[PDB]
Amino acid sequence: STGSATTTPIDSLDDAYITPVQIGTPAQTLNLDFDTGSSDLWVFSSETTASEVDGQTIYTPSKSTTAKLLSGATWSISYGDGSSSSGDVYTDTVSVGGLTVTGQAVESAKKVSSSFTEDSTIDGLLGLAFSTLNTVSPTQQKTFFDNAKASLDSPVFTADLGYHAPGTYNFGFIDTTAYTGSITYTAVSTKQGFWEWTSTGYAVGSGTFKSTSIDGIADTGTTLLYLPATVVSAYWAQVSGAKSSSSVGGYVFPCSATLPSFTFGVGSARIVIPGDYIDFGPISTGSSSCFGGIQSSAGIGINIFGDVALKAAFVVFNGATTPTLGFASK
């Protein structure tokens, strides 16, 4: 089997991407944030505290003839941005782009933090990291990909995120028309439950490439590119007026600037992030100070190849017995 679904930016900055997901019978379609940095499929629901729901579409398990309470199971998650959610669990039928999993754990939110409430466009998350990170207790549950894997034509999914435009998540096949050149594959460590890999270095604009190992995670659920302070300083030093602002919470730059590109290494291959991808707009409405899309990972504890980086590539998440990651230009 295969599946193919379009993923759409939630706003003009590409702060996140939503992909429609069918849950239950008859189908209830929710727009979920596909997140290769976590491993829970959770949704706003009929059980979510009413004051914490503000415009999201909810899953109502009582209206689904295939929903079954997973007795005794609960979940609770906290994300890198400080947001969180928790609740109980149903199993139900879940389909993404024509690919159907029966008996998928659907984690129903009883509580969500303010950040989720405040984002009317995201109805929940669909985790695509390794199932070892799944938070369901006392019986850990599998991700949608893990459940689908054996049925797929090939045990892979691909992320093809757009810049200020829709893109695609495919399951079970590699669309050879969706990228240019060849796909360069690179080793993955699953030890922390992430799609963790090592970039071979970087360049800033038309500068020379610096060969250096940068361990990080491919994370579709993180907006920006978080890299070591040395790398980030070298980037922003090429932008007149750029500075790290403790009050704002990262690097800012004059909105009048033209940003240089940033290149990262994948083996001997190179992915180029155009400068415009690194512009996240005014820090506040009407400001002439703009927020940078490359930020320091210092104090996160891990480097994160978030959407800023991933949207510059066609990315293969290869879930073969020994997982690997592939990157191509597009």
CA distance 101 to 137: 21
Interacting residues of 321 by C-beta distance below 8 A, sequence separation 6+: none
Place of tokens 């899309």: 293
CA distance 131 to 176: 28
What does the CA dihedral 171, 172, 178, 180 come to, rounded to 10 degrees? 130
CATH of domain 175-330: 2.40.70.10
Domains 5-174 and 175-330 alike in fold: yes
Domain positions in the chain: 5-174, 175-330
Place of tokens 């796909």: 183
Active site residues: 35, 199
Alpha helices in the chain (DSSP H): 114-117, 144-148, 229-236, 307-310
Do residues 170 and 316 lie in contact, with contact meaning Cβ atoms separated by under 8 Å?
Answer: no
CA distance 86 to 168: 29
Q: Is 150 helix (H, G, I), strand (E, B) or coil?
A: helix
Query: For the residues of 211-268, what is the DSSP string, one character each?
Result: EEEEEEEE-TT--SEEE-HHHHHHHHTTSTT-EEETTTTEEEEETT--PPPEEEEETT
Residue 232 backbone phi and psi in degrees, to 5 = -65, -40
Q: How far is the CA of 155 from the CAs of 99, 174, 235, 296, in angstroms? A: 13, 10, 37, 33
Tokens of 284: 């506040």
Minimal CA–CA distance to 300: which of 87, 37, 5? 37
Method: X-ray
Give the CATH H-level superfamily of domain 5-174.
Acid Proteases (2.40.70.10)
Which residues are 280's β-sheet partners?
Answer: none
Q: How far is the CA of 194 from the CAs of 38, 127, 215, 313, in angstroms? A: 8, 11, 12, 19
Residue 236 backbone phi and psi in degrees, to 5 = -70, -20
In degrees, rounded to 5, the angle at the alpha carbon of residue 308 between the alpha carbons of residues 317 and 212 is 75
Chain breaks in the chain (C to N over 2.5 A) after: none
Chain centre distance of CA 20: 15
Q: Is 147 helix (H, G, I), strand (E, B) or coil?
A: helix
